[PDB]
Design an enzyme around this catalytic site. Structure first.
Site, PDB file in Angstrom:
ATOM      1  N   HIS B  41      20.442 -27.107   2.960  1.00 51.96           N
ATOM      2  CA  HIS B  41      19.463 -25.772   2.352  1.00 51.96           C
ATOM      3  C   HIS B  41      20.037 -25.462   0.847  1.00 51.96           C
ATOM      4  O   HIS B  41      19.118 -24.625   0.567  1.00 51.96           O
ATOM      5  CB  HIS B  41      19.804 -24.607   3.184  1.00 51.96           C
ATOM      6  CG  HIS B  41      21.123 -23.780   3.122  1.00 51.96           C
ATOM      7  ND1 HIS B  41      22.000 -23.732   4.040  1.00 51.96           N
ATOM      8  CD2 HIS B  41      21.349 -23.059   1.870  1.00 51.96           C
ATOM      9  CE1 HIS B  41      23.141 -23.048   3.352  1.00 51.96           C
ATOM     10  NE2 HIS B  41      22.732 -22.585   2.477  1.00 51.96           N
ATOM     11  N   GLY B 143      27.742 -17.590  -1.746  1.00 54.42           N
ATOM     12  CA  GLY B 143      28.044 -18.834  -2.564  1.00 54.42           C
ATOM     13  C   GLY B 143      29.305 -19.480  -1.840  1.00 54.42           C
ATOM     14  O   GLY B 143      29.798 -20.168  -2.323  1.00 54.42           O
ATOM     15  N   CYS B 145      28.956 -21.062   1.008  1.00 56.15           N
ATOM     16  CA  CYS B 145      28.423 -22.078   1.857  1.00 56.15           C
ATOM     17  C   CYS B 145      28.963 -23.346   1.640  1.00 56.15           C
ATOM     18  O   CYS B 145      29.066 -23.526   0.307  1.00 56.15           O
ATOM     19  CB  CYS B 145      26.830 -21.944   1.940  1.00 56.15           C
ATOM     20  SG  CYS B 145      26.035 -20.810   2.987  1.00 56.15           S
TER      21      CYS B 145
END
Ligand SMILES: *[C@]1(O)C(=O)Nc2ccc(F)cc21
Ligand SMILES: *[C@]1(O)C(=O)Nc2ccc(F)cc21
Ligand SMILES: *[C@]1(O)C(=O)Nc2ccc(F)cc21
Ligand SMILES: [Mg+2]
Lengths: 304, 301
Positions: B41, B143, B145
């Protein structure tokens, strides 16, 4: 979101851990520049202690009595010297992985990470607080002497702890990196015990702010209190006194959440008296006192 | 000694954390050999969260659209492919700090350490467990991920988790390093909720054995139970069903303490019925379920 007991990344310290052997005793050392730091009791053997002056045993030791192992490379010891309860072993080669570092001494209630090592090999990392009785509740493994505690600022590792012994009640005692003990302990094989511990009030409050930041709000109430009134309640529940400095420290969390410190103390005063009534706070039914205000801010910020 | 929730030393994983940027989206990547693994993503914009067409978004990307940054050094992307829910960015430089590693998909109840990262820089490490509802209770800000979870057994790092999203309940969902989500979750901003969370029964049992090994016996009782009678009671407290595999797995710890597995089950039944009455087990006032039988055995218990 979420809140966890969080240790610092241990990589910078992992590159510093070496094995130190003298005779049958093997423990861990800290290799910075061309010096290996380790507990001085590594040189003690079960027969020689007859009320010794430590430098008597040390001056009988030759450089080649110290087998220092950095992974598999053997480090040549070219000098030895005592620094309080820490033994400083000069080696011929500098550690290429030496980070930017300082030796600092921490205050009770302050937190730090410990890199638990066995035979020079890092085994685990955990986060802990220097208890008011100057002990720390640490790891299970034997042969962990010489494991260090540390905080990281940006690139700089602040070494504050070296592990020396276990106390009969399961807790651990140690020195700073200059060999000064935390607490009224000696590094001999004599009977010692930790004093009665207390709860770090300012840290519990910081943890309550973390719960609020994370959506746990049921313990808030409309009331406030005085530093006098609360400290009287704290002393009966074996809580450290809350100073005006503690209130200032909690200032940022008090502004980020809208809950004043003495406002939050009113919640803590109810919790000490009436209990949690079956509820939990951040998945805990005990009041956590091992997060400093700045631990809470760091974790609820994103500092790297 | 004392029993502590310990994370693995994070050094070997630290050396692989990089920052991956696409457009205005920045997250963390895992740099192993000459591949950077990261959540797909990263190629989503604002108008893409609810129904992303990842193939459509990806076919429109060139290698130079992906900015990979390792420390101060920019890495050059020379290829890219998608595998399930992770992107694989081939880069021009093999990571010289690549450890011995493998990819492992774990089962509920398994534990691992998480290296929380932001902008490719490690910020802290903590120990987690895969909950029975295939979520983890981590600590993740925006942030984070692409942060990964791992175990380290004998200098070999086994990567088992990469973080993708936070659910409404505040728990976290992610994939293995092959990009297959744990549980029924998807990388869409559509309404999806975790199943009701249950207690990892086999882990609580192992933790009780650890308490006996450490010399704590106040919670034991005279009784045994049948496996099925235990599960009938434990389901009423939202405990996970105990299987025969769980009974076999606990075999070593029962032998070590001389307490039969179904004997410890009976004590757990009474603990659930009675509560702790202000007492603690291994310093905790709740029944701890994030130590695996393996964890307690090699915690030298
Ligand atoms: C030695 O017996 C030991 O283990 N610790 C220690 C401290 C000081 C000393 F003089 C000797 C020893
Ligand atoms: C220290 O040498 C170590 O590594 N383990 C340990 C246990 C007990 C003790 F008194 C000292 C040490
Ligand atoms: C993850 O990529 C991150 O760093 N922030 C974030 C927000 C929402 C989401 F679905 C995923 C992520
Ligand atoms: Mg109030």
């Amino acid at each position: 979101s979420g809140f966890r007991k969080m240790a610092f990344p241990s990589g910078k310290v992992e590159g510093c851990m070496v094995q130190v052997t003298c005779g049958t005793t093997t423990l861990n050392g800290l290799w910075l520049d061309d010096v290996v730091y380790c507990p001085r009791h590594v040189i003690c053997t079960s027969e020689d202690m007859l009320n010794p002056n430590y430098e008597d045993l040390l001056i009988r030791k030759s450089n080649h009595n110290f087998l220092v192992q950095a992974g598999n490379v053997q480090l040549r010891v070219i000098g030895h010297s005592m620094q309080n309860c820490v033994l400083k072993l000069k080696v011929d080669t500098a550690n290429p992985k030496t980070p930017k570092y300082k030796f600092v001494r921490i205050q009770p209630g302050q937190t730090f990470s410990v890199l638990a090592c066995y035979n020079g090999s890092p085994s685990g990392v955990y986060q802990c607080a220097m208890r008011p009785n100057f002990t720390i509740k640490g790891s299970f493994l034997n042969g962990s002497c010489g494991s260090v505690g540390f905080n990281i600022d940006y690139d700089c590792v602040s070494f504050c702890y070296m592990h020396h012994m276990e106390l009969p009640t399961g807790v651990h005692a140690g020195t700073d990196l200059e060999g000064n003990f935390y607490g009224p302990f000696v590094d001999r094989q004599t009977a010692q015990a930790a004093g009665t511990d207390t709860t770090i009030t300012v840290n519990v409050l910081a943890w309550l702010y973390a719960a609020v930041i994370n959506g746990d709000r049921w313990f808030l109430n409309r009331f406030t209190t005085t530093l006098n009134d609360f400290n009287l309640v704290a002393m009966k529940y074996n809580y450290e006194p809350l100073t005006q400095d503690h209130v200032d420290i909690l200032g940022p969390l008090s502004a980020q959440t809208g809950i004043a410190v003495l406002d939050m103390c009113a919640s803590l005063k109810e919790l000490l008296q009436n209990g949690m009534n079956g509820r939990t706070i951040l998945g805990s039914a005990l009041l956590e006192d091992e997060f400093t205000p700045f631990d809470v801010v760091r974790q609820c910020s994103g500092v790297t």
